[PDB]
From a paper:
The human SSSCA1 gene is located on chromosome 11 (11q13.1) and encodes a small soluble protein of 21.5 kDa with a predicted N- terminal zinc ribbon domain type 2 (ZNRD2), and an unknown domain in the C terminus.
Human SSSCA1 N-terminal Auto_anti-p27 domain (residues 1–111, predicted MW 12.5 kDa) was successfully overexpressed in E. coli and purified over a Ni2+-affinity and size-exclusion chromatography (SEC). The purified SSSCA1 construct was predicted to form a dimer based on the elution time when compared with a set of common standard proteins after SEC (estimated native MW of 24.6 kDa). The asymmetric unit contains two protomers that form an antiparallel dimer with a buried surface area of 1960 Å2 (‘Protein interfaces, surfaces, and assemblies’ service PISA35), the interface is highly positively charged and is mainly formed by the helical part of the molecule. We were not able to model residues 1–12 and 78–111 in the electron density map and coincidentally, these regions correlate with the intrinsic disorder prediction plot of SSSCA1 and confirm that these residues likely are disordered in the protein crystal as well. A systematic search for other proteins of similar architecture using available online services, the DALI server, PDBefold37 revealed that SSSCA1 likely belongs to a novel Pfam family of Zn-binding ribbon domains (Auto_anti-p27, PF06677) which overall fold is not yet available in the protein data bank (PDB). The helical dimer interface has not been observed earlier for this type of Zn-binding proteins and the closest zinc-binding protein relative from the zinc ribbon domain 1 family (ZNRD1) do not share this. We have determined the structure of this Cys4 zinc-binding domain and discovered that it belongs to a new family of undescribed zinc-binding proteins denominated Auto_anti-p27 (Pfam PF06677).
Residue numbers in the entry:
A (entry chain B): 13 to 77
B (entry chain A): 12 to 76
The structure:
């Protein structure tokens, strides 16, 4: 052990907050009526949602970044 | 019409949320136990990568979940 760097602690806390936000958005859109698909985003790994027969949506890529 | 989320969906959501919480907890622990964060995400799953003290690269999601 040496202590994690301050960099590593910020990135870990960021990564935490991000994932929390992604779960919260996915939940929001499921509640708003979006369909969960059995596929994940090829870019970021996030489970994909579908809005009727209008579109497929990644809450990460297409909203949070 | 709008339709609720299904039993399936809200299960997968709770699961994804648990996964992500565990990834963060695992990542943190490895950081505190001597593993250094890489500026790079797992190509399979998107998770930030670590290296151990023998410079093996290590994805907590892939190689422990
Ligand atoms: Zn994505
Ligand atoms: Zn991985």
């Amino acid at each position: 052990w040496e202590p994690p760097t301050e960099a590593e602690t910020k990135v870990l806390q960021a990564r935490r907050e991000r994932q929390d936000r992604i779960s919260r958005l996915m939940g929001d859109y499921l509640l708003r009526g979006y369909r969960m698909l059995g596929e994940t985003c090829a870019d970021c790994g996030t489970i994909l949602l579908q809005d009727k027969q209008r579109k497929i949506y990644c809450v990460a890529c297409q909203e949070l970044d």
